[PDB]
Amino acid sequence: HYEEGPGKNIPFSVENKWRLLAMMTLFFGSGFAAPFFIVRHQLLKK
Amino acid sequence: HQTHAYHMVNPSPWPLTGALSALLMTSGLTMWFHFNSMTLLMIGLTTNMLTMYQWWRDVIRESTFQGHHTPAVQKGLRYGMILFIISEVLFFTGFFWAFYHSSLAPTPELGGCWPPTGIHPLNPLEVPLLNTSVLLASGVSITWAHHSLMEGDRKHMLQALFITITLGVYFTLLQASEYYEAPFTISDGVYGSTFFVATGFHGLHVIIGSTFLIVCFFRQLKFHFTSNHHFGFEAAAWYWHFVDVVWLFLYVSIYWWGS
Amino acid sequence: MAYPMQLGFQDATSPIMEELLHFHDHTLMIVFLISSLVLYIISLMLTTKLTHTSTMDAQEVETIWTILPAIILILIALPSLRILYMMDEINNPSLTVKTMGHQWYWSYEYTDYEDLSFDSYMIPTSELKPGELRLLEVDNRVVLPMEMTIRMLVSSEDVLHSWAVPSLGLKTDAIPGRLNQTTLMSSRPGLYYGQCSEICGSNHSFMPIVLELVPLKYFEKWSASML
Amino acid sequence: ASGGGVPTDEEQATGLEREVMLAARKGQDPYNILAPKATSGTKEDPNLVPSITNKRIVGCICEEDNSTVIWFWLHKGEAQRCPSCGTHYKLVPHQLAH
Amino acid sequence: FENRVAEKQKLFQEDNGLPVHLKGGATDNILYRVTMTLCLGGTLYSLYCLGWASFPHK
Amino acid sequence: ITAKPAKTPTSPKEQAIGLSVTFLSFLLPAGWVLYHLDNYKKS
Amino acid sequence: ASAAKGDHGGTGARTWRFLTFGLALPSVALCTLNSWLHSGHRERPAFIPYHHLRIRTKPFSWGDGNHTFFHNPRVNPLPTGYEK
Amino acid sequence: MFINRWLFSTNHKDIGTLYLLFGAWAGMVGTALSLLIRAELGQPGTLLGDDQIYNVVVTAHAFVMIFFMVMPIMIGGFGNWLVPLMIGAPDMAFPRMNNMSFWLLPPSFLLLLASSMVEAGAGTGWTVYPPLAGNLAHAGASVDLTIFSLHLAGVSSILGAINFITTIINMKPPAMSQYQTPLFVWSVMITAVLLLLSLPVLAAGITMLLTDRNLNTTFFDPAGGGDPILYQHLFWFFGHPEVYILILPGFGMISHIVTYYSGKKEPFGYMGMVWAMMSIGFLGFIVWAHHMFTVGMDVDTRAYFTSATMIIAIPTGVKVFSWLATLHGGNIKWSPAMMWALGFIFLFTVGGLTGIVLANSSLDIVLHDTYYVVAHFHYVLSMGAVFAIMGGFVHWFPLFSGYTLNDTWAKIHFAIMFVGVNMTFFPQHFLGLSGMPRRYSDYPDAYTMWNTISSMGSFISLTAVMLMVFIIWEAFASKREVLTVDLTTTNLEWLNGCPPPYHTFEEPTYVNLK
Amino acid sequence: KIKNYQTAPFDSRFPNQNQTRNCWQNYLDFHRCEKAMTAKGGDVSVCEWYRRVYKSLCPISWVSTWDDRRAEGTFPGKI
Numbered sequence A: 001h002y003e004e005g006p007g008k009n010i011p012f013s014v015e016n017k018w019r020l021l022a023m024m025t026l027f028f029g030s031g032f033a034a035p036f037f038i039v040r041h042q043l044l045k046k
Numbered sequence B: 001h002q003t004h005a006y007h008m009v010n011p012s013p014w015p016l017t018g019a020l021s022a023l024l025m026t027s028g029l030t031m032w033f034h035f036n037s038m039t040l041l042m043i044g045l046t047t048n049m050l051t052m053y054q055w056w057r058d059v060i061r062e063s064t065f066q067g068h069h070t071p072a073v074q075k076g077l078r079y080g081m082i083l084f085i086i087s088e089v090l091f092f093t094g095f096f097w098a099f100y101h102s103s104l105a106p107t108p109e110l111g112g113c114w115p116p117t118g119i120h121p122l123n124p125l126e127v128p129l130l131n132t133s134v135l136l137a138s139g140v141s142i143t144w145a146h147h148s149l150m151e152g153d154r155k156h157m158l159q160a161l162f163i164t165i166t167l168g169v170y171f172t173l174l175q176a177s178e179y180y181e182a183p184f185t186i187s188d189g190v191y192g193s194t195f196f197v198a199t200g201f202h203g204l205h206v207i208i209g210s211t212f213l214i215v216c217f218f219r220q221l222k223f224h225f226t227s228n229h230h231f232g233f234e235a236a237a238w239y240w241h242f243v244d245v246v247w248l249f250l251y252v253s254i255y256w257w258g259s
Numbered sequence C: 001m002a003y004p005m006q007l008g009f010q011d012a013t014s015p016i017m018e019e020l021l022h023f024h025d026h027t028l029m030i031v032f033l034i035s036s037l038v039l040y041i042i043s044l045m046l047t048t049k050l051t052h053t054s055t056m057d058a059q060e061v062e063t064i065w066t067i068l069p070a071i072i073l074i075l076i077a078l079p080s081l082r083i084l085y086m087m088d089e090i091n092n093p094s095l096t097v098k099t100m101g102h103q104w105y106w107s108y109e110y111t112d113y114e115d116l117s118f119d120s121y122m123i124p125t126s127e128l129k130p131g132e133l134r135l136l137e138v139d140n141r142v143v144l145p146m147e148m149t150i151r152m153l154v155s156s157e158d159v160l161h162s163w164a165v166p167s168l169g170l171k172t173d174a175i176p177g178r179l180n181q182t183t184l185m186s187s188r189p190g191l192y193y194g195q196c197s198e199i200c201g202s203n204h205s206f207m208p209i210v211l212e213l214v215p216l217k218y219f220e221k222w223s224a225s226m227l
Numbered sequence D: 001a002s003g004g005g006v007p008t009d010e011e012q013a014t015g016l017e018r019e020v021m022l023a024a025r026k027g028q029d030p031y032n033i034l035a036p037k038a039t040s041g042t043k044e045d046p047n048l049v050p051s052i053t054n055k056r057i058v059g060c061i062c063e064e065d066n067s068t069v070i071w072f073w074l075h076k077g078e079a080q081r082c083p084s085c086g087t088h089y090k091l092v093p094h095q096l097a098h
Numbered sequence E: 001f002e003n004r005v006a007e008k009q010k011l012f013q014e015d016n017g018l019p020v021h022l023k024g025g026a027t028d029n030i031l032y033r034v035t036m037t038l039c040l041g042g043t044l045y046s047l048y049c050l051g052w053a054s055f056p057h058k
Numbered sequence F: 001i002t003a004k005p006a007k008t009p010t011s012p013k014e015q016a017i018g019l020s021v022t023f024l025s026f027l028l029p030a031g032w033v034l035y036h037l038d039n040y041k042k043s
Numbered sequence G: 001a002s003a004a005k006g007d008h009g010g011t012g013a014r015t016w017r018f019l020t021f022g023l024a025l026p027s028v029a030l031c032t033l034n035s036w037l038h039s040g041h042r043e044r045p046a047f048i049p050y051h052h053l054r055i056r057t058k059p060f061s062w063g064d065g066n067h068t069f070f071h072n073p074r075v076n077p078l079p080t081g082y083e084k
Numbered sequence H: 001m002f003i004n005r006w007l008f009s010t011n012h013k014d015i016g017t018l019y020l021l022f023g024a025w026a027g028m029v030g031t032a033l034s035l036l037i038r039a040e041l042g043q044p045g046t047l048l049g050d051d052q053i054y055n056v057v058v059t060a061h062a063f064v065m066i067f068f069m070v071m072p073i074m075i076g077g078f079g080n081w082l083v084p085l086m087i088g089a090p091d092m093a094f095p096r097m098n099n100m101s102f103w104l105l106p107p108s109f110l111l112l113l114a115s116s117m118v119e120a121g122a123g124t125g126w127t128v129y130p131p132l133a134g135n136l137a138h139a140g141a142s143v144d145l146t147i148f149s150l151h152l153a154g155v156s157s158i159l160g161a162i163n164f165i166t167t168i169i170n171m172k173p174p175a176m177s178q179y180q181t182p183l184f185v186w187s188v189m190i191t192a193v194l195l196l197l198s199l200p201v202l203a204a205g206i207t208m209l210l211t212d213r214n215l216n217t218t219f220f221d222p223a224g225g226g227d228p229i230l231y232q233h234l235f236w237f238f239g240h241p242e243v244y245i246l247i248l249p250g251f252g253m254i255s256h257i258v259t260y261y262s263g264k265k266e267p268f269g270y271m272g273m274v275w276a277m278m279s280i281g282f283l284g285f286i287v288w289a290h291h292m293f294t295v296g297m298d299v300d301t302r303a304y305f306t307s308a309t310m311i312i313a314i315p316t317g318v319k320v321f322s323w324l325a326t327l328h329g330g331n332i333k334w335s336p337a338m339m340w341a342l343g344f345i346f347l348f349t350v351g352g353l354t355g356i357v358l359a360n361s362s363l364d365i366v367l368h369d370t371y372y373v374v375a376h377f378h379y380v381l382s383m384g385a386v387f388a389i390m391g392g393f394v395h396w397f398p399l400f401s402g403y404t405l406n407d408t409w410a411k412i413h414f415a416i417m418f419v420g421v422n423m424t425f426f427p428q429h430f431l432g433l434s435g436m437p438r439r440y441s442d443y444p445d446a447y448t449m450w451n452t453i454s455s456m457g458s459f460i461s462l463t464a465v466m467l468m469v470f471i472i473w474e475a476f477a478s479k480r481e482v483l484t485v486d487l488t489t490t491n492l493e494w495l496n497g498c499p500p501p502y503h504t505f506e507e508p509t510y511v512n513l514k
Numbered sequence I: 001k002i003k004n005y006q007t008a009p010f011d012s013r014f015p016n017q018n019q020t021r022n023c024w025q026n027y028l029d030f031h032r033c034e035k036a037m038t039a040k041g042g043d044v045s046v047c048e049w050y051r052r053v054y055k056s057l058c059p060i061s062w063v064s065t066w067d068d069r070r071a072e073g074t075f076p077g078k079i
């Protein structure tokens, strides 16, 4: 069976707050950046 | 140990393979429609069949073999199927809305009349009437099958169910021939559009319903159903009646009134 | 047209638009009243140390807050519907003009007597004459006679567009295969602007409408000269 | 016109389905399918709450038709009272599965 | 035919800790691996197709 | 609600770092694209 | 309605089988008789290139892109007329 | 173990968590798109290009905010997490099908991103009206990828609706009647019923657009006797119920938040709240044509839709006044969640009232397809739906994670967002009344001031979104574990601790029938 | 004669915003009348009213397309 309790009922680790910061940064950052890069993609086709 | 009667399902890979098969089928349709390739579509249809097969196989294992379907679990499945059928009715409602919208106010491009100029509708008294008697008849035979099962009659349950399936297949064969023989096509304006898309989705449901009945036939052959617990058969029968009622509406609206 | 820092509606050019202004003033008062009343009550509930946390009975105060809003809705619906039917009144026009929406310009047809028709394109910003409005001017304006009931028929030859002139209270969608009717009647001479009001692709923002309202006599000479 | 060959629940029901079926036949409700009937709920006649552990959540609908349900853990030991209406409940632990 | 449901009930209730989708035996494992391989492989292929369609071929 | 003191306290310095990194993760990529907008528009 | 028959003292398996073979299947047999009688290929109408029919806004994703899915040469003309 | 737990889940809490994660990520995408919109409109002229690239952005913004952020968070996230706990159920009725509802979203999202990558994207508006969305004006795969994205999101929600309705009807304690379930549970069931009935019509409609685009049908093409207006009817028949689907779970969470922070054991007039949500749900199916007041419909039809639309204000009014009546006499706890709820009550009321202005077909002639509509819906969506989500998030975060947020930072986040959204949307009322059209990449010079101020407000909101991410990080970084929560006697979802164990209610609650 | 026409007057048969059938009806009426007159040996001047009405209401491209189709033999309306 599975681990339970604070910080254990999630798909990401919160054991290290800095590794966590990196994860959250990539996660939320990739989402926010996507539209800008798609706009860039559309501009560089024609 | 749990002290409630509900089913805690084992972690399953089917929801994921099912979702991915949906992505492969839609991506596949796009590839087919625009990049002239059916590769993705083929893979999607295959994984989808595999997913459905395994998912429902597991439901049978969980119920017939493991005994997880207590009365409370069965009651939930009843609501689930009724709700599913309701959503299917609303889907068809959209197509009937499209049909009535077009036919009740024929535009100048059609000649301002219905059926449109140049369209020669099938005779509703011919194969379409036959199709109607075929589905209505299968509604009676499936009721005989239900009563036989409840009365614990194995032989007659199988007999009635076999007859119901043969009738569904007969309908499908008749419809396939009607499609080939029709002088109009899906590209013949809004008449062909409404006709083929509505009867086409209905035909698809007939195929799905027949397949469901065939599953029941084999589960029955294997003694899965008891005279009192047989939800799979009940669901197949409710779905079958739905398919029958949709046809009656199509027949009255499109084939008869719309001719 | 709209002017810098405009808060409300463009000044009414037709009797119907005047009617809508008064109806909007009426409705907006109600909007202000109810929203400020709610803001006020929120602040009232949050500003006391007195408490009453036990069960409160509801079937008495719910009558008030069901009947009042019902009355207010009727006080909005009445003038709303009166104006609605007024816009539908039979008026019998002196002239019929058609406008076809196109992917990125409007064409006009005055075919009552002669077969007059022309295209109307936005004046590019690089070609604007001094004092002309960016994105709003067209090469060929829709000259029409002032103080007269005109029937405008709107359609499209490709995708959806929508023919609008705010100052006159007009907005009629341009649908291919359909001929939508609206009536126009300017109380004054002048130039009246509008813009395509249904997303139609690449230059949806750049296919304006400009009406030029002049006395009947000038409208007739303009018609002849435009053949 | 008639015959047999279709299994009955008595012959073929299994797992939890069979347990519920057999328990119901003895008039028992180990899987909490039915709503328990309240006693007078006094200190002397408390509502007896079955449990397989030493605590169970109780939901008290103080008065018939109340829309608000009062929830609390009932622990093994002396009877506890609903925080809202004061009716008594007492936990009666363990067993179910022999 | 004969009623063999009891045999199947024994097999699927056997305490081997296997989840229902693998409890039938080795074939379940094969079918599962085929399904998942087609799903994941097909998804990678669809991503490739998207990459292809994303760019103009003038 | 009551809670226990932080198991791994995040000091003001640590918060400045997390806030800065967070803001930069949003601002930099978009800023880069927006800055090179003209280079994209005609190329 | 109440039909024109009767039973209702207890609708069971025997009654539904009675209806299957005494009413339902005979109805299907009659409609099958009627249908496989009024059939016969009807003389295809003269071709007129109406603009609201034989629509082609995009070629079909099969064949030569100009034939419908269940194209029947005998009765379905192409946008240019019947086939050879 | 990781794959078994997160990819093969049959647990309502874990699945709710997946939904909250998905919705948070989608919110970032939707925010970026909204910034692209406001950057283009920030000053006169063209920034990105013409209306095509601009409208591809506007279209995606809407689809992302609606289908990938709001619905997944409210229904899939809060719904899955809270509904089983609030009725003391061990899980959802169909725990495995529940997992497929989730897994259909990433593919759906991928199809939406694909459509904007191929060709020139789908710059159709989220309504996807033909002929612009047809195979002549939008040739290529873009619109088809968009339709397929909607199909997947549709199946996801329909199966989700079946699951919620069955769970709520069938899995409550034997003694608990439907009139003994919390208001959030009621809001979710009603929302599920709307989804069940409306999405199949949308599916029918977009399938017809797909066939018109690829199989030579002509449902919406006049050349074959079709009608573009037919599509509008089918879309809006789904479309209006959809907006109530977006706000109903919000209404449910607001009732719990207001009740909780007012120190009350129950919301004022429970039965009136149930009545109001059901009425709203019902009326929401007979008013769709108010989205079509300029298409050229008969005056009597317009008079009917104007009248039917206004009636919704009555039941909605009962809810507003009941929330205020719940605050009345309360021992007010000025927590961040209460602030979001108070802002919701006022701002939603404003947006609802401008909706009543729009209900008048006469006035709507002039307001339709202008920024007055954009202002109305952003008040009810970007202030209403979003504030309910933020309030619910801050309120239940400790339950879901077992950790507490920093209340001061959360109050700072609310303050910034409040200024941001109001500065962004309030000026849009002026732009609308004065005639600025919707879906424009540039505007006549007179509209410059309000568009400038509106774009500045959108940057303030961006700042709040970035701060929110930091706040969540700080909570997980500091690890302040929850101890005690007040009012558990009337908030069952908290009774199993924070976070509750993987398996809750293995032994069901005991509830006397008396 | 009995004319002096400004524009097509209100027609109680088509009192709504959608005027598509008004145009269509008058176009059909004119061409039906024109055919009856040219046939039985009469004068097309009696068909004048319908011609004026449809010319006033109908988009040039519609009339043009319908004319091309009557010529091609593909006009779907009955004349």
Ligand SMILES: CCCCCCCCCCCCCCCCCC(=O)OCC(COC(=O)CCCCCCCCCCCCCCCCC)OC(=O)CCCCCCCCCCCCCCCCC
Pocket: A009, A010, A011, A012, A013, A023, A024, A026, A027, A030, A034, H006, H013, H017, H018, H020, H021, H022, H023, H024, H025, H106, H109, H110, H113, H397, H400, H401, H472, H499
């Ligand atoms: C897209 C993903 C970004 C990739 C970054 C991950 C890198 C992994 C390195 C790998 C290095 C190994 C490190 C392992 C452990 C920790 C990292 C983790 O396990 O790795 C992955 C985990 C964890 O996620 C993370 O990694 C960090 C997330 C931190 C989230 C904080 C959220 C706070 C909000 C509160 C939420 C509720 C919780 C509160 C309550 C508590 C819960 C009870 O995720 C999942 O397995 C499931 C999530 C699925 C879907 C969510 C949205 C995706 C949408 C995509 C659609 C795209 C369409 C095309 C789009 C294509 C783009 C063009």
Ligand SMILES: CCCCCCCCCCCCCCCCCC(=O)OCC(COC(=O)CCCCCCCCCCCCCCCCC)OC(=O)CCCCCCCCCCCCCCCCC
Pocket: C007, C008, C009, C028, C031, C032, C035, C036, C039, H350, H354, H422, H423, H426, H427, H429, H430, H433
């Ligand atoms: C940022 C925008 C800057 C705009 C500055 C205006 C410049 C004035 C030039 C000063 C120049 C004066 C000369 C101009 C007169 C022309 C009158 C007219 O024909 O034009 C009529 C127009 C113009 O509107 C006006 O007649 C002025 C009304 C202004 C109301 C301002 C409220 C400001 C709140 C502060 C922050 C906004 C967010 C609050 C949220 C409120 C929600 C609406 O009417 C409208 O349709 C606009 C408003 C539409 C819908 C909002 C309804 C709900 C309001 C709720 C009030 C809450 C109050 C609590 C107090 C609010 C506490 C928060």
Ligand code: HEA
Pocket: C034, C038, C068, C069, C070, C072, C073, H127, H243, H244, H246, H247, H290, H291, H309, H310, H312, H313, H314, H316, H317, H318, H320, H348, H349, H350, H351, H352, H353, H355, H356, H358, H359, H360, H364, H367, H368, H369, H373, H376, H377, H380, H381, H384, H385
């Ligand atoms: C959360 C989403 C949401 C919600 C809840 C609503 C709620 C309402 N909406 Fe809105 N609406 C949208 C989302 C929403 N809308 C969207 C997205 C669009 C545009 C779609 C597009 O084109 O893309 C739109 C468009 C739209 C239009 C079309 C405008 C146009 O395109 O020209 C109309 C027309 O009537 C309208 C009306 C209403 C009304 C009357 C309500 C009512 O439900 C509001 C009722 C509430 C109140 C009235 C306030 C509280 C009540 C009181 C305090 C009681 C006292 C009140 C009175 C006496 C009046 N909406």
Ligand code: HEA
Pocket: H020, H023, H024, H026, H027, H028, H030, H031, H034, H035, H037, H038, H058, H059, H061, H062, H065, H066, H069, H070, H073, H124, H125, H126, H127, H374, H378, H381, H382, H385, H386, H389, H390, H393, H421, H424, H437, H438, H439, H440, H441, H458, H461, H462, H465
């Ligand atoms: C829920 C719906 C939603 C939301 C929230 C928003 C939010 C915003 N929208 Fe909206 N918008 C629409 C739905 C929405 N919009 C729709 C339907 C259209 C019409 C499309 C069309 O015309 O076809 C539209 C159109 C539209 C236009 C008009 C475009 C035009 O006509 O040309 C503009 C212009 O300014 C705009 C701006 C913004 C801005 C600046 C925000 C900002 O307020 C956004 C700020 C950020 C957030 C509020 C997101 C925060 C939430 C999260 C990130 C989740 C957090 C995670 C957890 C709590 C778990 N939007």
Ligand SMILES: CCCCC/C=C\C/C=C\C/C=C\C/C=C\CCCC(=O)O[C@H](COC(=O)CCCCCCCCCCCCCCCCC)COP(=O)(O)OCCN
Pocket: B159, B163, B166, B167, B170, D001, D002, G021, G022, G023, G025, G026, G029, G032
């Ligand atoms: C191209 C078409 C293909 C599609 C066909 C679709 C479905 C058909 C497929 C199979 C159906 C036929 C048989 C099914 C298989 C086994 C049946 C054997 C059972 C049997 O013989 O049953 C008997 C019934 O007669 C029977 O079949 C009789 C069955 C035959 C009935 C139809 C014949 C009609 C005859 C003419 C009458 C018309 C007059 C109209 C009257 C007015 C109606 C109201 C009753 O007997 P028992 O002693 O009480 O029962 C002991 C247990 N078996």
Ligand SMILES: CCCCC/C=C\C/C=C\C/C=C\C/C=C\CCCC(=O)O[C@H](COC(=O)CCCCCCCCCCCCCCCCC)COP(=O)(O)OCCN
Pocket: B175, B176, B179, B180, B181, B182, B183, B184, B185, B186, B187, B196, B197, B199, B200, B201, B203, B204, G068, G069, G070, G071, G072, G076, H151, H154, H155, H203, H207, H210, H211, H215
């Ligand atoms: C035999 C009766 C049973 C009907 C179904 C059997 C075979 C067809 C294959 C799939 C059909 C499934 C659903 C219906 C979809 C489109 C209508 C198809 C109905 C049909 O089969 O219509 C045919 C057209 O075929 C065509 O284009 C068909 C081309 C096949 C393309 C399928 C395209 C699929 C589009 C799928 C979109 C699915 C979206 C579903 C959403 C569900 C909810 C999310 C008619 O043939 P015709 O030559 O024009 O005229 C006959 C002239 N002699």
Ligand SMILES: CCCCCC/C=C\CCCCCCCCCC(=O)O[C@H](COC(=O)CCCCCCCCCCCCCCC)COP(=O)(O)OC[C@@H](O)CO
Pocket: B089, B090, B093, B096, B097, B098, B099, B100, B101, B102, B104, B105, H298, I016, I018, I021
């Ligand atoms: C049933 C509830 C109570 C009844 C109260 C009224 C509400 C719905 C009524 C349903 C039936 C109405 C049919 C009457 C037809 C009269 C109108 C008509 O004739 O409308 C036609 C289309 O109707 C059409 O498809 C109509 C097709 C359907 C549209 C209505 C939408 C509801 C359908 C979904 C409901 C789900 C229920 C599930 C069913 C099992 C054509 O359009 P017109 O605008 O006329 O254009 C003419 C112009 O050229 C001139 O202006």
Ligand SMILES: CCCCCC/C=C\CCCCCCCCCC(=O)O[C@H](COC(=O)CCCCCCCCCCCCCCC)COP(=O)(O)OC[C@@H](O)CO
Pocket: B052, B056, B057, B059, B060, B063, B064, B069, B077, B081, B207, B208, B209, B211, B212, B215, B224, B225, B226, B229, B230, B231, B232, B233, B235, D012, D013
């Ligand atoms: C060539 C054709 C391929 C086309 C694709 C679709 C193919 C087939 C669809 C047919 C579906 C077959 C479903 C098989 C279900 C078997 C599992 C089953 O029937 O499971 C039953 C439960 O019902 C259950 O979950 C009921 C489960 C309900 C499933 C029905 C849903 C239909 C699916 C429709 C999908 C398409 C939608 C339409 C597209 C627009 C098991 O309980 P019981 O029967 O009581 O048994 C227990 C007793 O033995 C105890 O003594």
Ligand SMILES: CCCCCC/C=C\CCCCCCCCCC(=O)O[C@H](COC(=O)CCCCCCCCCCCCCCC)COP(=O)(O)OC[C@@H](O)CO
Pocket: B007, B009, B018, B019, B021, B022, B025, B026, B048, B051, B052, B055, B058, B059, B062, B063, B068, B073, B077, B080, B081, B084, B087, B088, B091, H093, H094, H095, H096, H097, H098, H151, H152, H155, H158, H162, H200, H203
């Ligand atoms: C190409 C264009 C778009 C394509 C989209 C394709 C999307 C998905 C395709 C793959 C999905 C197929 C896999 C089989 C799904 C079966 C679900 C099912 O059968 O789910 C059942 C519940 O729904 C019930 O009963 C009753 C409900 C039965 C629902 C059957 C699922 C059909 C999926 C399609 C639905 C379409 C929506 C229709 C409206 C237009 C069982 O619930 P579980 O949680 O499993 O178990 C509970 C246990 O206690 C049982 O022992």
Ligand SMILES: CCCCCCCCCCO[C@@H]1OC(CO)[C@@H](O[C@H]2O[C@@H](CO)[C@@H](O)[C@H](O)[C@@H]2O)[C@H](O)[C@H]1O
Pocket: F027, F028, F029, F030, F031, F032, F034, F035, H035, H036, H039
């Ligand atoms: C709507 C969301 C966005 C909000 C606004 C973003 C806020 C500002 C973020 C800053 O980002 C950047 O700023 C730059 C300049 O300040 C860039 O440098 C660039 O410019 C230079 C300096 O002029 C050079 O040194 C390098 O070549 C260079 O690419 C740059 O790449 C980018 O990361």
Ligand SMILES: C[C@H](CCC(=O)O)[C@H]1CC[C@@H]2[C@H]3[C@H](O)C[C@@H]4C[C@@H](O)CC[C@]4(C)[C@@H]3C[C@@H](O)[C@@]21C
Pocket: B154, B155, B156, B158, B159, B162, B221, E001, E002
């Ligand atoms: C073998 C089985 C008897 C019960 C048993 O399995 O022991 C019999 C009884 C009734 C069934 C039959 C029914 O009479 C219906 C069908 C009629 C036949 O024409 C073909 C096979 C047919 C489809 C069935 C095959 C047959 O093998 C079945 C399955």
Ligand SMILES: C[C@H](CCC(=O)O)[C@H]1CC[C@H]2[C@@H]3[C@H](O)C[C@@H]4C[C@H](O)CC[C@]4(C)[C@H]3C[C@H](O)[C@]12C
Pocket: C059, C060, C062, C063, C064, C066, H271, H272, H275, H318
């Ligand atoms: C009868 C029903 C439930 C009462 C209960 O069983 O507790 C109650 C709940 C909400 C009530 C409604 C709401 O309070 C709204 C309306 C209020 C007016 O005071 C009367 C009619 C009115 C429409 C009410 C009628 C009736 O009293 C309702 C419908």
Ligand SMILES: C[C@H](CCC(=O)O)[C@H]1CC[C@H]2[C@@H]3[C@H](O)C[C@@H]4C[C@H](O)CC[C@]4(C)[C@H]3C[C@H](O)[C@]12C
Pocket: B097, B101, H230, H233, H289, H300, H301, H304
């Ligand atoms: C809008 C829809 C037609 C959609 C379509 O054209 O496909 C039509 C069908 C039936 C119409 C309704 C019915 O004709 C009955 C009502 C008639 C009144 O004159 C107006 C409201 C009234 C309630 C109608 C409103 C609206 O025009 C409806 C709902």
Ligand code: CUA
Pocket: C101, C102, C104, C160, C161, C162, C196, C197, C198, C199, C200, C201, C203, C204, C205, C207
């Ligand atoms: Cu033409 Cu917008």
Ligand SMILES: [Cu+2]
Pocket: H239, H240, H243, H287, H288, H290, H291
């Ligand atoms: Cu609406």
Ligand SMILES: [Mg+2]
Pocket: C162, C197, C198, H294, H368, H369
């Ligand atoms: Mg519009």
